[PDB]
């Protein structure tokens, strides 16, 4: 499913990401844009056997278990397939485990390079929340 930016911003706020660990809501919407272009079914096989899944591109070597990735740690303790849904719950919940402090969004390369330093709030202005 491809979320509109406003529809996603509203869902992520309802799931507690607004100012989570000090990160304004726009950071999360921006990260989702550059990680999965707002698509919940998004997938990307990396050079190393790990594949990223869902709206927030959760990694299969460290966070979710796809049962095909060597060195799999499954820190979110969840099957990767559980992260490819219209409902963003599982993905938000794992993202919250990932972001343990105020540097945690660096977990997403797309965010560190393409969102950090930009007006992430631009992604939510005009959205009803």
């Amino acid at each position: 499913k491809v979320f509109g930016r406003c529809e996603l911003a509203a869902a992520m706020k309802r799931h507690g990401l607004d100012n989570y660990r000090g990160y304004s809501l726009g950071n999360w919407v921006c990260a989702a844009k550059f990680e999965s272009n707002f698509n919940t079914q998004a997938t990307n096989r990396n050079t190393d056997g790990s594949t990223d899944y869902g709206i927030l591109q959760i990694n299969s070597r460290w966070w979710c278990n796809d049962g095909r990735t060597p060195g799999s740690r499954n820190l979110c303790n969840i099957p990767c397939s559980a992260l490819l849904s219209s409902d963003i719950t599982a993905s938000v919940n794992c993202a919250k485990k990932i972001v343990s402090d105020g540097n945690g969004m660096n977990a997403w390369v797309a965010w560190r390079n393409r969102c950090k330093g930009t007006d992430v709030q631009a992604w939510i202005r005009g959205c009803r929340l």
Partner: antibody
Amino acid sequence: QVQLQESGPGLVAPSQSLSITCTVSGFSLTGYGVNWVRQPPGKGLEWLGMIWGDGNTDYNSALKSRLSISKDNSKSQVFLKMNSLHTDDTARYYCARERDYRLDYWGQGTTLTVSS
Amino acid sequence: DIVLTQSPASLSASVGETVTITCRASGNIHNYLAWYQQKQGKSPQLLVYYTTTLADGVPSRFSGSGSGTQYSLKINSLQPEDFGSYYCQHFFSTPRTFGGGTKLEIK
């Protein structure tokens, strides 16, 4: 450690322009915005403008025509240029780092006096 | 532009008392309001951001509240080091603006 220090002319001729430098350290200018704020002696804080991590700039509406902010990421320096110096531009000028919509670190500031 | 109206201009109180400062915005700033404290001869220091979050090291006696167009900073049982000035600033789009400031003074 995150640090910011302003450097400036001190006294400038109203028949001249202004140029203030903000040297930062402890962070990359590419990842944080830097706002310029002034405060006339004994008065409040006034927002001048900002340069985002990505280089975009935004300015105080009323002063926009006289203001210009730019930076050199590699040199970790942000610049404020102001022209048409009225005596009312006399103030302590500060540059502050913006981290996700809050000015978390401020320089000590630099005092500017608009002469005759 | 969005203008911030900060009241009162001055406050006279004694250590142990609880004070409140308001800042109302001419337009909805959607929680993007921060507060700063500035002591005599010093630069402003961040106290609260995104309306209610205390900056690191800021004593819990400080609490921010608000939404939409109205916000306030409350200092519970203020202490010697609280005396000085306070300013609110909004971060909803640009340009940004500050409230008029409030001078908290020893009674």
